[PDB]
Design a protein around this ligand. Structure first.
Ligand code: HEM
Ligand code: HEM
Ligand code: HEM
Ligand code: HEM
Lengths: 145, 141, 141, 145
């Protein structure tokens, strides 16, 4: 990423307001709902047949919290995402076989979720800093493929 | 393709947009300019400054066309033919840029319609914007 | 939208492929795995090694379907219904990948049909593969 | 870019057999034909109404040679495409208003022209290395946008 100092503060300031548990489940559920093809990795999660089935599924919720947890850590090492995510990159590739495009879809969903949550506070320029961030994470996650 | 559900979803969320469409159109452009700077290459003739009247004017135009697509949800290819021709033959905007505007349009709606921007509606609006994009790019080659 | 000229161009080009379609099928996949290593995520159960019978056999499978599509250039949606189904509800390959296989297939034909790979034929084949891609991803959502 | 010495040799050696003149004219012409919207930047070139008219247009041919020339010179700086195309990056952005996506389109067209030309010689592994290069160049050219 190429984050100006002031882009870095704006990311961090807003992130302080986020309930990673909540946003985590929202982002992941929404992904499975807007791009149903992404459901291919979760057949063991059960019922994902309707929006309510997904959004409320205890497993989706718990998984989302995990993913966002790992993401939050990435935010404290914005200087070394590749390093931060190396073992996770290897895992997604070698074990899980997750196409890295999934990582960009989740990034976009996440940006919609932050907009949803923060309303007017998610200014054009705050969005621009988060766009750089989600792209950096997706890139870091795909680096070991 | 848009299902009956999708259609209700879209008419419903767009319904709420009402008279703010114009302003939301302008805002989507600005977010796009700031997040995806490469889209600026198509507006070398515009003042892209914050609150540019050109951007404002352009946002209205985009919003009006979307509103027109909603009004003719069962005949979009025809309701949008003119605009399809323009983009294909004069503007010649690379296809990938449509996905970028769509996304900034979703962000704007989300930021303004917390109550209506449900998962189901989000999904429906995404398929809708994808459909409009498909139409505007249908005559490219 | 394939023009009459396009359909002609495609039928001609493919005509020449003949008994080698299976081999070209296999070669495009191999070019795909090496050039876009992310595409390998959909074949964890295959031996992706050079000249692997899994790749060879799959190459055949892909070629035949393309053949069938050239044959029903006029009724693709209908000729590939089953395959659209399979990909949308079972395989669930991400739509970005279709452009990667398409490109690898052009590269393959270019390398093998020098005289027939004219600029105009190149244009037709591209649109053709795009069309096939569209059909295969039309029931995703 | 992130080319293996072996991948470096493969690029290097095939290139040495390239007639820049012909390949450059063909790559640019094919672009204008396969992706007709790229013609928006070459209005002043003339008749692009047909493949025949594009492929024959000398303005196209000569521009193709200029483009491949610069590309050619970049293969000598595979370790710093970024610093090699910085000025070219600013020009394309600030003076030409060319969307970087165009860079990617040409890249791919370029690869089809090389295959077209070298048949047998342009093997899967040789394509992989070229793919890395075209991506690399496109990225460097987009860098100052
Ligand atoms: C922000 C990007 C992401 C991060 C930081 C992330 C993080 C994680 C973490 C920490 C785990 C658990 C690791 C372990 O089991 O040892 C995990 C597992 C997993 N992730 Fe990712 N993830 C991301 C995106 C995705 C996406 C977009 C998908 C699919 C659409 C995905 C699919 C999976 C799957 C299938 C598992 C294993 C679940 C199981 O336990 O069965 N991940 N991820
Ligand atoms: C679905 C999305 C889109 C819609 C509904 C849309 C609609 C329109 C409309 C209604 C106009 C004005 C035509 C007139 O003068 O009557 C226009 C013009 C234009 N659009 Fe599109 N468009 C879309 C996507 C894009 C994208 C993605 C770009 C580039 C990033 C773009 C670039 C342009 C440009 C450069 C003009 C001419 C503006 C001027 O000089 O006044 N459009 N569009
Ligand atoms: C040119 C467009 C494509 C065509 C015509 C095509 C056609 C086919 C055919 C004919 C089959 C075999 C069906 C059967 O076994 O009865 C198949 C299966 C499959 N395809 Fe698609 N395909 C296309 C694109 C893709 C892409 C881009 C990918 C992934 C990157 C892909 C991934 C798969 C997989 C993983 C299978 C199952 C392989 C196995 O387990 O044997 N396909 N496809
Ligand atoms: C391989 C990637 C490319 C390279 C290395 C490259 C390089 C060049 C060079 C060296 C010039 C000379 C102009 C000057 O120095 O004043 C030029 C001009 C230009 N390029 Fe690029 N180019 C690339 C891709 C493209 C593409 C894909 C397009 C559009 C489809 C494009 C559009 C133009 C235009 C419109 C000019 C100005 C020509 C004129 O002044 O008549 N370039 N480019």
């Amino acid at each position: 990423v190429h984050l100006t100092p002031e882009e870095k503060s704006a990311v961090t300031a807003l992130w302080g307001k986020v309930n990673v548990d909540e946003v985590g489940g929202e982002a992941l559920g929404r992904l499975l709902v807007v791009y149903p093809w992404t459901q291919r990795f979760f057949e063991s999660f059960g019922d994902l047949s309707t929006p309510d089935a997904v959004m409320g599924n205890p497993k989706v919720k718990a998984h989302g919290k995990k993913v966002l947890g790992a993401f939050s850590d990435g935010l404290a090492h914005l200087d070394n995402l590749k390093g931060t995510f190396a073992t996770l990159s290897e895992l997604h590739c070698d074990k899980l076989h997750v196409d890295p495009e999934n990582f960009r879809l989740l990034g976009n969903v996440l940006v919609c979720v932050l907009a949803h949550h923060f309303g007017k506070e998610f200014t054009p320029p705050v969005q621009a800093a988060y766009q750089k961030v989600v792209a950096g994470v997706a890139n870091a996650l795909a680096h070991k493929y | 393709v848009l299902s009956p559900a999708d259609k209700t979803n879209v008419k419903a969320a767009w319904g709420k947009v009402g008279a703010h469409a114009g302003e939301y159109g302008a805002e989507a452009l600005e977010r796009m300019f700031l997040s995806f700077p490469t889209t600026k290459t198509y507006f070398p003739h515009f003042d892209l400054s914050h609150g540019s009247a050109q951007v404002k004017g352009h946002g209205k135009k985009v919003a009006d066309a979307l509103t027109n697509a909603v009004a003719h949800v069962d005949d979009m290819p025809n309701a949008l033919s003119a605009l399809s021709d323009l983009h294909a033959h004069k503007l010649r905007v690379d296809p990938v840029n449509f996905k970028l505007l769509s996304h900034c349009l979703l962000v704007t709606l989300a930021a303004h319609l917390p109550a209506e921007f449900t998962p189901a509606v989000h999904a429906s609006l995404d398929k809708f914007l994808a459909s409009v994009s498909t139409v505007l790019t249908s005559k490219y080659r």
